[PDB]
Amino acid sequence: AEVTQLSNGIVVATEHNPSAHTASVGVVFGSGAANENPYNNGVSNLWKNIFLSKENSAVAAKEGLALSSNISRDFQSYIVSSLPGSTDKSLDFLNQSFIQQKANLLSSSNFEATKKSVLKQVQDFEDNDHPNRVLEHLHSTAFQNTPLSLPTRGTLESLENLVVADLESFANNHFLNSNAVVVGTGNIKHEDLVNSIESKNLSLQTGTKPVLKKKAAFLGSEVRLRDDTLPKAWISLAVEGEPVNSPNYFVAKLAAQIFGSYNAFEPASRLQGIKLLDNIQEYQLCDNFNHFSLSYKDSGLWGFSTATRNVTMIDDLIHFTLKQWNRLTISVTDTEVERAKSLLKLQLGQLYESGNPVNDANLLGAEVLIKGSKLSLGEAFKKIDAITVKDVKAWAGKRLWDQDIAIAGTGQIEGLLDYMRIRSDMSMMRW
Amino acid sequence: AEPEHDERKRLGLKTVIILSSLYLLSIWVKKFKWAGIKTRKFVFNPPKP
């Protein structure tokens, strides 16, 4: 439970844990899909793919190292996992790929083979992963003509028109030192890693800063991807949520826990202490749903996603769900809040403390890049337990009550009513 | 023949003012409630076989 972070020439962040069996090392840059353009959209995802290319991956496999990368909206990460003893050989492969081979990975035979793979990759996503496809379009319409609208995997049209030069241009503008953080998770000590880093000098493009842009903004709107050939309807609906480092960061996440997630086929899920379940189970309004409180640097999204085969009652699904959310402003109970606290801790714990260091790296990296530090799991619980019904009400009355929404859906959505009908349900009539 | 004349025209004045306002007002409310539909936009991408 130690969050150590020091700065020499580069900012080093680590979180050591005795028993772990393995150690993960990697660099996390403060720029992701939110930094791209509509035309070079997908460059970051492309970088990730060559970094994991058969060539670069085989070089690490001989050495007994495993590679992992993750492209997000606000950040980007390249991670190498190793045994606690080879904590130095991971750094050799890291530097060898970001300075030495930052020209060998970009060969005309490797690039074309990779491009052909991310194309079949992004295509497969759009053709079959409907729930994530819908969630991606939700960001697209909610944050249209703004940084958060760009999809992480990039679009097919911007991808196929991408060249080696675009990779370089992005790398020379974002893979900078002032826009990076070296992260180490597993079991290795902070002093053990910082020494191996401060050993090898050479700045390489120091003092250089990444380009600036315009602030992200939420726009109440919708995108309907109707497709009657699909056997279900997948929808996602949300309001402007909370950005990371917001006073209500936790109040929002708790609010989403109150309604939680559901799976009609799992006996135990049908028994949860969620009032909404009394309404949706009678006629089986859906196969599943899940609420979320997505947070990013400039903004976020609070809402839910759902999947259903009850195509003639989608209006009841949306109506009952929105009536429940109305409650947060006027009648949420003490016990609902308390149930949420307990469940929020359990989920927040299971995330922050998993038996996998690669997840730890992403969580640590993403946090330190935005606030310059990481809030300890024990510190979070103190904030969570401090939330009162009055807090949730004040939050809901500002973020949910009579506020614009963003909608996205695909499949048999003929039954999903017009925007104004959904929007009207964001409140209730009163004397 | 028309003993209600003076009073009738006075009531008409109030009636016409209220109704005129209600008319102009409803137009505005209608346009607002319809803005999402009126400016709605479609795109077609022919499905592959």
Curated annotation (Swiss-Prot), chain A:
One of its GO terms (cellular component) is respiratory chain complex III. The keyword Manganese does not apply. It comes from the Eukaryota. Coiled coil: none annotated. One of its GO terms (biological process) is mitochondrial electron transport, ubiquinol to cytochrome c. Signal peptide: none annotated. Keywords: Electron transport, Membrane, Mitochondrion, Mitochondrion inner membrane, Respiratory chain, Transit peptide, Transport. The keyword Membrane applies. GO terms for molecular function: metal ion binding; metalloendopeptidase activity. It is a peripheral membrane protein. It is found in: Mitochondrion inner membrane. Its main location: mitochondrion. Transmembrane segments: none annotated. SUPFAM superfamilies: LuxS/MPP-like metallohydrolase. Belongs to the peptidase M16 family. UQCRC1/QCR1 subfamily. Component of the ubiquinol-cytochrome c oxidoreductase, a multisubunit transmembrane complex that is part of the mitochondrial electron transport chain which drives oxidative phosphorylation. Component of the ubiquinol-cytochrome c oxidoreductase (cytochrome b-c1 complex, complex III, CIII), a multisubunit enzyme composed of 10 subunits. The complex is composed of 3 respiratory subunits cytochrome b (COB), cytochrome c1 (CYT1) and Rieske protein (RIP1), 2 core protein subunits COR1 and QCR2, and 5 low-molecular weight protein subunits QCR6, QCR7, QCR8, QCR9 and QCR10. This is Cytochrome b-c1 complex subunit 1, mitochondrial. The lineage of its organism: Eukaryota, Fungi, Dikarya, Ascomycota, Saccharomycotina. The gene is COR1.
Curated annotation (Swiss-Prot), chain B:
This is Cytochrome c1, heme protein, mitochondrial. Residues 39-49 are mitochondrial matrix. Belongs to the cytochrome c family. It comes from the Eukaryota. Present with 39900 molecules/cell in log phase SD medium. Component of the ubiquinol-cytochrome c oxidoreductase, a multisubunit transmembrane complex that is part of the mitochondrial electron transport chain which drives oxidative phosphorylation. Component of the ubiquinol-cytochrome c oxidoreductase (cytochrome b-c1 complex, complex III, CIII), a multisubunit enzyme composed of 10 subunits. The complex is composed of 3 respiratory subunits cytochrome b (COB), cytochrome c1 (CYT1) and Rieske protein (RIP1), 2 core protein subunits COR1 and QCR2, and 5 low-molecular weight protein subunits QCR6, QCR7, QCR8, QCR9 and QCR10. The chain crosses the membrane at residues 5-38. It comes from Saccharomyces cerevisiae (strain ATCC 204508 / S288c). It is found in: Mitochondrion inner membrane.
